[PDB]
């Protein structure tokens, strides 16, 4: 049935502005402070979106908060890549309507290499001809793609939920495909794409952590929730206590 | 909680 997709389309977050003053110079401090503010603003929408996902409330409340705190980077990068693909044909990084990165900003932000990887991800939506439905299901699955090595409060409930979202992705593929071999090829492609998000998120996790530690010395502002989650949960990822769930080796 | 701000917003 279209119920699952009806829900995902219904809860998809709308446009979010960074509040960036485009009249000011493209300095490291200004660009990163605006990216951080955008992060806080998007985090609010990720929370509301997540709480409205089918079966999400079945997870222990502490696990609900944990998975959002571990996966927000990947979720936001994936969504930004989609915005960039649909808006500027992946030509530039469309973080927000008021915060679009060109080559100069990529350099000034001091994360040019990471921006290059994000652009590559954005382009994949075009090369693979990802449909809005495939994008929506893949994004939902990203929320359930990173957990503690020791497990969650109620790991069994999480494993069941994750399995159901993989099932939904399989269904969206089999929707317009009679041949099973073509379905297998598509599923391989989509899982490969999903895996590719993790190394990018990891580089950004490292970058934002190092930035938070020296933020006072570089005049970069971090909103309250961002500073909280980056100092408490991000280090768990960087130290290996929390790891992404990869489909492929 | 180590993330009191996030938790407060989430719990609302
Ligand atoms: C998630 C955000 C903001 C939301 C988005 O569109 C993707 C983008 C990816 C880079 C992140 C940024 C939030 C702030 C961060 C984490 C900076 O501190 C360094 C990397 C930035």
Residue numbers in the entry:
A (entry chain A): 670 to 918
B (entry chain B): 96 to 107
Excerpt from the paper describing this PDB structure:
Finally, effects of substitutions at the +4 position were assessed in structures of AR in complex with peptides containing FxxFF and FxxYF motifs. By contrast, the conformation of FxxYF was the closest to FxxLF. Other than FxxLF, only FxxYF makes direct backbone interactions with Glu897. Unlike the facedown orientation of Phe+4 observed in the FxxFF peptide, Tyr+4 is bound edgewise into the shallow +4 pocket, making interactions with Val713, Val716, and the aliphatic portion of Lys717. FxxYF was the most ordered of all the peptides, with 12 out of 15 residues observed in the electron density. Significant interactions were observed involving residues other than hydrophobic residues of the motif. Lys+2 and Met+6 are predominantly solvent exposed, extending out over the protein surface. Met+6 is bound on top of Phe+5, while Lys+2 makes a water-mediated hydrogen bond with Asp731. Thr−3 of the peptide defines a new subsite, with the hydroxyl group forming a hydrogen bond to Gln738 and the methyl group making hydrophobic contacts in a pocket formed by Glu897, Ile898, and Val901. While previous studies have shown that complementary interactions between charged residues flanking coactivator signature motifs of coactivators and charged residues surrounding the AF-2 cleft modulated binding to the receptor, we find that the flanking charged residues are typically disordered in the electron density, with only Arg−1 of FxxLF interacting with Glu897, and Lys+2 of FxxYF forming a water-mediated hydrogen bond to Asp731.
